[PDB]
């Protein structure tokens, strides 16, 4: 029933997603829950004030879906486990989407703000990491799933906004359900 529209883990190359402020999100090599190598994104400008870092995915073809589901796997560092604690450090990030009939996204085109971008939600982690453990990684990657459904255009982009946290977007899986019944 489930149909994947995009899955960052199957890239087997570079994601090449757009980063509005270059000094914010950046693409880096990472690991999957089942201990596998993939392409991930991270931000950690906890020493800089007024952070508003955006990350935009490639154009995602709709393929006959209206209700879109976004599965996000991520790690968020505990703000108290980072020495110089200003007070602006955060542990959440926002997810947005923008639909369009054509790619057309450039680097400026769709303004980088809540205005044109439609907010899906503020994503929080059930488990932030500080250190702990005494044998090896076993559980510290969060999984959050959200949905939205106006999507009527040929495709859409997804955007993630950070505002002063230290986090890593490990994977993003987008899918819809086209029930045979």
């Amino acid at each position: 029933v489930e149909e994947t529209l995009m899955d960052s883990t199957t890239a087997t190359a570079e994601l090449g997603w757009m980063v509005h402020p270059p000094s914010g999100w950046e693409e880096v090599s990472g690991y999957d829950e089942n201990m596998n190598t993939i392409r991930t994104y991270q931000v950690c400008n906890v020493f800089e004030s007024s952070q508003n870092n955006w990350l935009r995915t490639k154009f995602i073809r709709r393929r006959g879906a209206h209700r879109i589901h976004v599965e996000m796997k991520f790690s968020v560092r505990d703000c108290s486990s980072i020495p110089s604690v200003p007070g602006s450090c955060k542990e959440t990030f926002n997810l947005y989407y923008y639909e369009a009939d054509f790619d057309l996204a450039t680097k400026t085109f769709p303004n980088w703000m809540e205005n044109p971008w439609v907010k899906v939600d503020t994503i929080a982690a059930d488990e932030s990491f500080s250190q702990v453990d005494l044998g090896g990684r076993v559980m510290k990657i969060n999984t959050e799933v959200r949905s939205f459904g106006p999507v009527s255009r040929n495709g859409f982009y997804l955007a993630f906004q950070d505002y002063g946290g230290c986090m890593s977007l490990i994977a993003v899986r987008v899918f819809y359900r086209k029930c045979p019944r």
Binding site: V28, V76, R77
Partner: protein, 138 residues
């Protein structure tokens, strides 16, 4: 250099032949390791392949990762598409991912490699990274 330091990890590189290859960097600078790359017209015998390890000084000095290092990268694709296979390391203070790698100003870090087809594990190719103290970095 600037902010990104390119390192061509092969035995023909004079920088490695002098055996004391090191780079002076500042927090948030990057290290880009370029694996040996050969066109398709090579019997893959003269083709160099390596496993790269991050080790401590003693491991660095002896060309031994055993009990003193972490396997870091694998230059196992001497025929990758878009140019040489490349691995990158950012000298960041805090990792946004569990037990990732963190670096500190004024400290030295080391990397060594062992040939895959194995030559002898003798005088390995190695690199020392000196992360400059805050006072030096602007």
């Amino acid at each position: 250099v600037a902010d990104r330091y390119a390192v061509y990890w092969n035995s023909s590189n004079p920088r490695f032949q002098r055996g004391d290859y090191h780079i002076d960097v500042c927090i948030n600078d990057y290290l880009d390791v370029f694996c040996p790359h050969y066109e398709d017209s090579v019997p893959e015998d003269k083709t160099e392949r390596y496993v790269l390890y991050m080790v401590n000084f003693d491991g660095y000095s002896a060309c031994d990762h055993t009990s003193k290092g972490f396997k870091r990268w694998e230059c196992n694709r001497p025929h990758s598409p878009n140019g040489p296979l490349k691995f990158s390391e950012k000298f960041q203070l805090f990792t946004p991912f569990s037990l990732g790698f963190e670096f500190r100003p004024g400290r030295e870090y080391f990397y060594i490699s062992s040939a895959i087809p194995d030559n002898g594990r003798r005088s390995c190719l190695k690199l020392k990274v000196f992360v400059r103290p805050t006072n030096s970095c602007m």
